[model samples]
Target: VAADLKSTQEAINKITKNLNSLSELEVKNLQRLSGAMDELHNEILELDEKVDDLRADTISSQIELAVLLSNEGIINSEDEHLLALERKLKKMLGPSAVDIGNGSFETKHKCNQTCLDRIAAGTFNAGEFSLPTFDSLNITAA
Candidate 1:
């Protein structure tokens, strides 16, 4: 790879030198060549982005497969599995309720902090945030 990269660099250097020493007509031709090269460069950049996206997707798929195996009693040790079950049981219980002035609402603020913190910090740029409001409310107790 290194040798190939060095050869590519040498070719580019030679082309640059040749283009620099060209006549006016040759320079015009070079300008057309440069425009074509720019288009090809842009295409290469898009290709690079697509390749990176595919790589990311592949990684995500592999991670999901690992997670599925782990969840299906396959990968992790017995001790780790027991610990996970214990944690799951703990989470099944609702958070401690709190007393409010009008009514008491269940205090369930415990959540993954990373996403919440990102939202609070405005790092996740969700465009055009809007929510529909209820027009009428009907509540009755028998």
Candidate 2:
């Protein structure tokens, strides 16, 4: 019975070591995720600002067009009507267009955060990380 008890104790020790290693690996992955998320957020903000600038330029061009048309008497009377129409169109289509424009950054942020969460929780598949193999045995030894 002593031999059996010794074997059982060894098994328990092995399991405990494995669990500790897994926890440490998770912590390392969490740190990586945090860094990646920061990068994603910065990139997203930069891209969003760029698109916003472009949108502003588009509005400016529309205003210029309205002025030119008013001077040509093509629209009749003041440029108010044309300006109003331009604004209305921009407002109506603005959200959809901007959403598409901003989607890249937003999506990247979401994907990165999700990946980090999955990794930390040990729920992410090995394929996602592109690892040749995952052996928890090595984890505890490390």
Candidate 3:
């Protein structure tokens, strides 16, 4: 009877040690899973931000082109005129013509009929422009 009890105790000890080792392994696996989830969450946030930026850029480009077309009197109702304007603008400015939409109609430039004619005729000149001379000015004054 004594020998049987001793054998039973030894078996119980071996089982308990195996269970403890398995528990440690499970804890380590859980920790690794949590870390991977954190990394995935951060990547999702970065992708979301990039998507928002792309949306804003697209809207801005559309607004710019619309303004330019409106200024040039190219209406969507007149498909032929609109197509011609697109070709002309493309030829004059290449891809940068799309940026004209961002400009204000109130600003002065060579975009108007008379100005464009002068530029095409090679008669436009920036004559007699003045700039402040730093030699006559003091850095510190009242």
Candidate 4:
């Protein structure tokens, strides 16, 4: 990925270096090529940024980060998976809740209604984050 970005930068630089010599018509289409490369560069930067943000998260921060994502529509308010956890959390709130951590799962008690309604619109607490367990335990999300 480092090489990818560097190569793209090199490609863009090559265009700028040769821009003065190319004909008006040729230079114009080269601009198109540059444009696409520039767009790809931006996307790669954003992709890197997204991964950086995710990796920066801890167990607690992961849930909080996902909540912001849900609020931002990255997770889609209507995503049924949040509801699935809302229900799952409802059931898992016993001693085994601590089986996961000390009061870690407790914060999610209100996650059940995070996205339910305009009137009932509950902000994501832990509702959208339950899906990560499947990634850890290799269980699966319904």
Most accurate candidate by TM-score: 3
TM-score of each: 0.36, 0.44, 0.47, 0.28
lDDT of 2 by residue, 34-82 (tens): 7777766765665565555555556545545655665677776646777
Model 4 weakest lDDT span, ten residues long: 128-137
lDDT of 4: 0.43
Candidate 2 similarity to native, TM-score: 0.44
**Residue 20 displacement in candidate 2 (angstroms):** 1.1
- Work out how many backbone clashes candidate 3 has: 1
Which lDDT values do the candidates have, in the order given?
0.45, 0.52, 0.49, 0.43
Could you give candidate 4's per-residue lDDT for residues 1-142 as a string of tens digits? Answer: 1345555666667666555435555666666667667655655555554444333333334444445555666667566786454445444332222223223332221122212232233232222211111111122222
Better of 1 and 4 by lDDT: 1
Error of 4 at 56 (Å): 2.3
Q: Give lDDT: candidate 3, residue 88.
A: 56
Alpha-carbon error at 5 in model 2, in Å?
7.8
Which regions of candidate 2 are displaced past 4 Å?
Answer: 4-14, 68-80, 86-142
Once fitted onto the true fold, the runs of candidate 3 whose alpha carbons sit more than 4 angstroms away are 1-3, 73-142
Cα lDDT of model 1 by residue, 69-109, tens digit: 55566555565765565445334333332222122122323
Q: What residue pairs clash in candidate 3, if any at all?
A: 64-101
